[PDB]
Design a protein around this ligand. Structure first.
Ligand SMILES: O=C(O)/C(O)=C/C(=O)C1(Cc2ccc(Cl)cc2)CCN(Cc2ccccc2)CC1
Ligand SMILES: [Cl-]
Ligand SMILES: [Cl-]
Ligand SMILES: [Mn+2]
Ligand SMILES: [Mn+2]
Ligand code: NA
Ligand code: NA
Lengths: 199, 189
């Protein structure tokens, strides 16, 4: 009834935003539910950040004409599920993928907030996909690699204002959580932990 | 994780002697599902074992219900207003002497000495208040260097701690992914 705007209300507002202002796309159902079920501040924070990330990844997949990698399949798994074997193959989990004929589109997306880190991340993700172009070619597959670098957190599943307010509340939860942890590290419980070093 | 919590519960149930003073904290421990809470209640359960041994060795009543000093006195008909809020690991009123006990575990000499002085000061700060009310404080500080206790076999005490430590390890390893991952950038953004 009376809003005092402390951490429990911060968590409750994040849940309202999640429920009522993030589009009801079925690919988001599992992470929304994961988020809504968290009770510990640090865990609300973490799954909240992951929910936001998932909105951006799926947004990228849709705009890039790719299938979003819902279950975090590896490239090997994606291949093996279509009857194609590539056995010497490093671990790569793409944000998106699409096998058309003999062509395998693979998508990496990211958000960076400065030009220097934008460019650095773009190079890293590009090299990441490139290093398996040859193996795929051996197995008869043409790699079509896509790196979608973004400069902000905008996405089609949340209105701009809600996206901003969701991030704003996550930041306030982070501040609370950090203070909660500092207070914990001054408690006897933390001392008893330290002592558990007996092992 | 489930296996870890499941192993911890079996130890709690089968290899901690059934002294009834431990029953409540065992039940508190057994109802925890969340890792951070399992760890805290597990450490409290080990602490209760040590405290009860200490009380039994000091001719004191273990403070099972977390009574305050103020409460302990009232129950014996003694009124002492203004007392700061202190909850002792143990107590006993004999004649006009109130034995108060503080127990602790520390695993280095440096941390041992620091805690010993802290609990000593903690009790000392109400000596005058009690004397005004006609009560002589008998303050006991009992420092332990490990979690050894009369309620558990040494092998079970070690396994219990080993499991709690693995829980703590997993949590530190998790927070090192929130540290190095895309979700970190977002949070520091
Ligand atoms: O450092 C210690 O050895 C120690 O015995 C600590 C405690 O008893 C407190 C923490 C605690 C430690 C162990 C257990 Cl089993 C339960 C609680 C903290 C001090 N107290 C804090 C407090 C003060 C006033 C009112 C309530 C709580 C009580 C709980
Ligand atoms: Cl498609
Ligand atoms: Cl804005
Ligand atoms: Mn205590
Ligand atoms: Mn104590
Ligand atoms: Na499409
Ligand atoms: Na805005």
């Amino acid at each position: 009834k009376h809003h005092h705007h402390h951490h429990d209300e911060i968590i409750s507002e994040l849940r309202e935003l999640c429920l009522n202002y993030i589009e009801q796309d079925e690919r988001l159902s599992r992470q929304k539910l994961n988020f809504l079920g968290q009770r510990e501040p640090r865990m609300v924070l973490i799954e909240g950040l992951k929910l936001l990330s998932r909105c951006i990844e799926i947004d990228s997949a849709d705009k890039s004409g790719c299938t979003h990698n819902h279950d975090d399949k590896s490239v090997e798994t994606i291949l093996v599920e279509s009857g194609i074997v590539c056995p010497g193959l490093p671990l790569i989990i793409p944000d998106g993928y699409k096998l058309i004929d003999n062509s395998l589109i693979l998508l990496e997306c990211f958000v960076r907030s400065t030009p220097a880190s934008f460019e650095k991340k773009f190079i890293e993700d590009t090299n990441k996909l490139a290093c398996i172009r040859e193996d795929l070619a051996v197995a008869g597959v043409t790699l079509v690699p896509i790196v979608d670098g973004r400069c902000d957190y905008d996405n089609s599943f949340m209105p701009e204002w809600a996206n901003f307010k969701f991030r704003d509340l996550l930041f306030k939860l982070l501040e609370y959580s950090n203070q909660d942890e500092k207070v914990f590290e001054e408690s006897e419980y933390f001392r008893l932990c330290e002592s558990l070093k007996t092992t």
